[PDB]
Design a protein around this ligand. Structure first.
Ligand code: GDP
Ligand code: GDP
Ligand code: GDP
Ligand code: MG
Ligand code: MG
Ligand code: MG
Lengths: 124, 192, 124, 198, 203
């Protein structure tokens, strides 16, 4: 199993376990240069991101991964992309998509870029 | 038949779903569209001008994650923006919802609704609130349920004398609306 | 609009224009270091990528973008994520996701990383 | 409530899976698309001498043209039809791949192999190559030729009655193509010979 | 002289005494201080830039009944925390030793050592060992002298401020009482390498 796929898989498992368990602790995986785009809205840096995720108005959420793909980049980063499903509170199950970019800074793989969208569209 | 697409929008937990579900035949005849994240409740109203139908679009809760898709707004002919009278933040988000709505639908009539007026400790009062009408509502008590739909129907059809010759069958009240509070609330708003 | 959003949007528009009319002409956006993961199957290099995409057994295809989010990376790349719907031949409409990592080489942006999935799951 | 059987219909893109299932008019009329799963489920009712049976046929939304199916597409399938194109030798050589997946995800369910488009004269995959809990049939979806055969065999297997018969054909879309009676007779014989060899 | 107090700590039975005793002259020249429950071993190592002397403090076994007194830790300039890779409880106590060490000596350089890696059926593996994150980790086997010099070399480099410092010769060590399988050693070194390169951030 390639090293990048190992790091990616670990990151994905840790991110969603923690998100479902407690959003407020996800700060540790980011840094101040980190970029989040969450359903079109943008946030920069550890604090603003943690503020955003913590403020999401659901009492409980659960994620499941359908597929996760990993790649190395020319600049020795790792791309991690997810397609899965989630369930907030008692609402219907919805598909989702999420993209992570990982960079090794100070001997740890931190997320430099993060993008999230629900699998909802314009055509019924 | 005369049918109008009505989009029901507003912050999560403001009572949008509880409101629409009140209309019983609308709940029974609803249709879930997974790709759009919507439940369309076909709400029939019998008027002095015959039957009209408000196809009310209720979210699958995705407003918790962010804004709604264009396809949710597209071809809406009217809208209800809801907030929680006990939560001031849901009310300060009304302009954002209005903005998101107008961006897809420029000139449709809109009704603003402050829900949960049966909760005595109320944070948003008539003082702060005063093609856009406002009504106090309480979804759990059926209070003023018909008001937004009657206004929109008159507005849409262009008949200020349109009347509902019959009230739809509503789920029985799960809460009592205090008659004295209602009268006061109604008095406060009447006066301007 | 930021520069990375302008560039990203142009790439996206050009990619799906090409993809919907002539897949065979998609080589120009890729390089030999390019990585494609297509529904789990990994491909490396402009030649192998163009071959895969050309070999896809449909006659016509059409994409509509539901949302596209663009970010700048710390190594001055542009990472883009796409969620939308497509229709191949006369088949039903399906949801899809796609990620691109764009790198500026010789004042020309090229795709170094590409990931694709249909928004399909094991359970509703 | 009713005795329903989930039938998964699989095979290479362009083999005629969708054209085949659509032949059953009520099943088309009453089908249901679930985009999240990438499937159109057709309720195909057949009436046997021992009563009605209902096959819930899962037809893909063409995602086999993009890659593999999700395992959840196969889950709880009680029978299956693997489909190939007798005018395309590659579709036939990919049959073991489909069979491979089915056996992996699913129980030892009955499976029918169907070689489609036998109305097309220029046939590449013939009986001899095909015959060397599984059965084969020639079919032509566009002409309703042998349309009922896969369902009758599966019905017999699932119910455990080898003497099961269909008392009447469901409403079928009228043939858009003629199945040459001479070719059909010939193919039917080619199969008789290939069976005698087996 | 150029000497440093080194406190060697960790649960009882982890192999602290076996470890320090490997240095034969340091054992020969040791001084016992009953009141502090300690035997101090003068461990001399000879570097390319000259000799360095780690005066290692080894307990008299009091760690079996609780923590060590402040008199033991005080004035230490560096330290080694040891645990037993066949005993999970001793690794789970590593944070407790760190805390007490930091209370009396705030900022000193520390090496973490997983002892008894010669024993098959190791319980605390490389992947599990991410604690260290002035901290460094090494596998060691005292009975076989495996990696015996690693902790002292790392500590010598930190203390003197020279990361290129080398040992020109190994001190006289007790002959191995046990074999360290070379293949098993190579694997363990690889695991630790990979664990480090695939590290996610700390909680
Ligand atoms: N007291 C009171 N509570 C309400 C009313 N309408 C809704 N709720 C409560 O508000 C909570 C969220 O309501 P919901 O319909 O799910 O809000 P939505 O997210 O906009 O659909 C629920 O626990 C309801 O019981 C109301 O008129 N009065
Ligand atoms: N001549 C002939 N063509 C067929 C038959 N069945 C399917 N086709 C053709 O095969 C092409 C793809 O068929 P389709 O049902 O979409 O195959 P699928 O991808 O397996 O669902 C279409 O152009 C059909 O006209 C048949 O029985 N005879
Ligand atoms: N197999 C093995 N046993 C060891 C090693 N080091 C110490 N021991 C054993 O562990 C037991 C206690 O060791 P000791 O040095 O007294 O541990 P301490 O209490 O931390 O000083 C003794 O029976 C030793 O034989 C080692 O490297 N390998
Ligand atoms: Mg709701
Ligand atoms: Mg098909
Ligand atoms: Mg001891």
């Amino acid at each position: 199993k390639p090293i990048w796929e190992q790091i990616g898989s670990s990151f994905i498992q840790h991110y969603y376990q923690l998100f479902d368990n407690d959003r407020t602790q996800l700060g540790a995986i980011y840094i101040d240069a980190s970029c989040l785009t969450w359903e079109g809205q943008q946030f920069q840096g550890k604090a603003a991101i943690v503020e955003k995720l913590s403020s999401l108005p659901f009492q409980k959420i659960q994620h499941s991964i359908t597929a996760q793909d990993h790649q190395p980049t020319p600049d020795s980063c790792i791309i991690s992309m997810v397609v899965g499903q989630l369930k907030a509170d008692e609402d219907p199950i919805m598909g989702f998509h999420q993209m992570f970019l990982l960079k090794n800074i100070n001997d740890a793989w931190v997320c430099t870029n993060d993008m999230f969208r629900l699998a909802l569209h314009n055509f019924g | 038949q005369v049918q109008f697409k009505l989009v029901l929008v507003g912050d999560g937990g403001t009572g949008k779903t509880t409101f629409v579900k009140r209309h019983l035949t609308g709940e029974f005849e609803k249709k879930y569209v997974a790709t759009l994240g919507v439940e369309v409740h076909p709400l029939v109203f019998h008027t002095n001008r015959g039957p009209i139908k408000f196809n009310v679009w209720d979210t699958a809760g995705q407003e918790k994650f962010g804004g709604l898709r264009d396809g949710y707004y597209i071809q809406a002919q009217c809208a209800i923006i809801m907030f929680d009278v006990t939560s001031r933040v849901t009310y300060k988000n009304v302009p954002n919802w209005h903005r998101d709505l107008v961006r897809v639908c420029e000139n449709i009539p809109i009704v603003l609704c402050g829900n949960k007026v049966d909760i005595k400790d109320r944070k948003v009062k008539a003082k702060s609130i005063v093609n856009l009408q406002y009504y106090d509502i309480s979804a759990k008590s059926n209070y003023n349920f018909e008001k937004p739909f009657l206004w929109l129907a008159r507005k849409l059809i262009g008949d200020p004398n349109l009347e509902f010759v019959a009230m739809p069958a509503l789920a029985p009240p799960e809460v009592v609306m205090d008659p004295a509070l209602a009268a006061q609330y109604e008095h406060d708003l009447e006066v301007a």
